[PDB]
């Protein structure tokens, strides 16, 4: 239960370093979804990000693995969470 509050992510987007050399932008285009665009990885290889959603409607955190190429997008439901963190899987 650490991260940025989802309420602080807007349609404009915010950029994160998930782990060394791996950068992504998160956008919140509606209150139910989080859109992740992969921006850069070491060697431009497929990412290996762990997304952790917590708080809010969630009594316990939920995690999702995101393995996508730079330039690709992953949409995920936020499940009423308050908080999100990006880490290395």
Residue numbers in the entry: 4 to 92
Which sentences from the paper describe this structure?
Avr2, a member of the ToxA-like effector family, exhibited structural similarity with the SIX7 and SIX8 models (Z-scores > 5). Analysis of the models and topology show that SIX7 and SIX8 both consist of a β-sandwich fold, strongly indicating their inclusion within the ToxA-like structural family. Here we demonstrate that both protein pairs contain a ToxA-like family member (Avr2, SIX8) and a structural family 4 member (SIX5, PSL1). Likewise, SIX8 and PSL1 are adjacent divergently transcribed genes in the Fol genome, and we demonstrate here a physical interaction between the proteins. We subsequently utilised AlphaFold2-Multimer through ColabFold to model the interaction. Manual inspection of the top 5 models (top model shown in Figure 4C) demonstrated that the thiol side chain of a free cysteine in PSL1 (Cys 37) and SIX8 (Cys 58) co-localised in the dimer interface, suggesting that an inter-disulfide bond may mediate the interaction. Collectively, these data demonstrated that the SIX8-PSL1 heterodimer is mediated via a disulfide bond. We crystallised and solved the structure of SIX8_C58S at 1.28 Å which confirms its inclusion within the ToxA-like structural family. Despite this, AlphaFold2 models were critical in solving the structure of SIX6 and SIX8 as templates for molecular replacement. When the modelling was repeated with the SIX8C58S experimentally derived structure included as a template, the interaction models and heterodimer interface were of higher quality and essentially identical. The region of SIX8 involved in the interaction with PSL1 was modelled incorrectly by AlphaFold2 when compared to the structure.
